[PDB]
Amino acid sequence: QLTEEQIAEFKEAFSLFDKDGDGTITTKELGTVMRSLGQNPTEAELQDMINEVDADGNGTIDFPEFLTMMARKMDSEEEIREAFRVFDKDGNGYISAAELRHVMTNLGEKLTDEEVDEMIREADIDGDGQVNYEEFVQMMTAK
């Protein structure tokens, strides 16, 4: 009994990587995402990530193999704080609308001001238009 909300979240995650919508994630695609996020994995390191979950040996990740990676790859505290540090680029720590838009762009999402504000309304518990660390922790632990 998977829900369609769960399935949609899996789809959305798969699509981040599968830039060409062909249903297969390649080292090229995995690398594209990682570089836009500031990382610099080598081709060989990317291939080793794939090999780990590549059940049919074809060298690329398909949907159920991806679900396998997520099961395996997804320190509660240290993991939430490291993510916060990516969002709160200037370290003040409030995540501004401009900081959120920068992360979202790197996630291949081109957003306007209005849904940036919608995004912020998921976590913002004092209505200052920003997400601070406590609000960030709440958002990650809620329903």
């Binding site: 995650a13 790859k73 997804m74 993510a83 992360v103 990650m140």
Partner: peptide, 16 residues
């Protein structure tokens, strides 16, 4: 989308 986006950042972080 916000919570889901954080998870996607964390995923790539774990991959590296």
């Amino acid at each position: 989308k916000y919570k889901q986006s954080v998870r996607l950042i964390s995923l790539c972080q774990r991959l590296s």
